[PDB]
């Protein structure tokens, strides 16, 4: 009830720019707020890169076990897992899990390199019907989040549709879809974001993102108790380059959505 009024009020109180896209797969209804505006994805783009490598592994059947060298010079600004394996190797499965569940930026860069560069991630998006997503840069510069810059952006509507196809539809093969869902459900970074606005009994798999301009993002698949899953994207960015993160705004958006549901 009055979901538009409530989301607009939350955005006004927050001082920033809020983008929401819900898909309720019980009946295919949607709730959209700035659903067609572009937002900087930051680490939520790791879902598209991991999924692209999963798709590659449908035909390169041992790809996920392939070792990748981690060198000291490869470390960027946030490498909680890769720093443990510097001067050694990680497999592409280990890199995918590190990217998704710890938001490891060096792991992201290895996924991007496996796909031939940022354009390889965009090409996979196009192959699964996403004409809006674009990845332009590697980590860490994909997080600059400059207002009006289309680089490394998507819209909430497009990201929600793609996350539905990846996790609940058939953009991936059955084993690969299950692997993506397993990884998202094991995320370590999400308890303050969409999850915090939802009943604790619900099952959530999500990927967070953060960057400059206080950009604070989360994209989630949600299995509510006793009903069909939801897909929810909450993107948020702020006027000041050095603004603080606002995961509470994402939780507040999710809580509004769960009320009107
Ligand atoms: K920040």
Automatic annotation (TrEMBL):
Its EC number is 3.5.2.6. GO terms for biological process: beta-lactam antibiotic catabolic process; response to antibiotic. InterPro entries: Beta-lactam/transpept-like, Beta-lactam_cat, Beta-lactam_class-A, Beta-lactam_class-A_AS, Cefotaximase. Keywords: Antibiotic resistance, Hydrolase, Metal-binding, Plasmid, Pyrrolidone carboxylic acid, Signal, Zinc. The keyword Zinc applies. Pfam families: Beta-lactamase2. One of its GO terms (molecular function) is metal ion binding. Zn(2+) binds at residues 139, 143. It comes from the Bacteria. Residues 19-234 form the Beta-lactamase class A catalytic domain. It catalyses: a beta-lactam + H2O = a substituted beta-amino acid. The keyword RNA-binding does not apply. Gene3D superfamilies: DD-peptidase/beta-lactamase superfamily (3.40.710.10). NCBIfam families: bla_class_A, blaCTX-M. Belongs to the class-A beta-lactamase family. This is Beta-lactamase. It comes from Escherichia coli.
